[PDB]
Amino acid sequence: MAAVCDICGKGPGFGKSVSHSHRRTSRRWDPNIQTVHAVTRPGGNKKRLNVCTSCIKAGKITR
């Protein structure tokens, strides 16, 4: 559930995890993608849409 935001192109970040000893390793910062249904008009079909939370705050907000 870290798929690229369907309506933005927001992908995951890649980078390092600085441990106590400064030892670097590889990690990923997936965006907080939640599952919502897609509605284009009142009473819509409710398809599906993997969307970022910033758009849940403003944009393709259905339910």
Partner: protein, 47 residues
């Protein structure tokens, strides 16, 4: 979220009264039903 209430709701009040929504009640309750609208320029339409 600031909405203009178009139908009476015990939680918020009378038609066009006010809004004190906890960011989501309207997103998935009011707006599907059409009980309120986005307070963009409806504040101008109403007053």
């Amino acid at each position: 979220m600031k909405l203009i209430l178009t139908a009476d709701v015990d939680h918020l009040g009378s038609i066009g009264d006010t809004v004190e929504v906890k960011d989501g009640y309207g997103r998935n309750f009011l707006l599907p039903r059409g009980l309120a609208i986005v307070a963009s320029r409806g504040a101008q339409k109403q007053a």
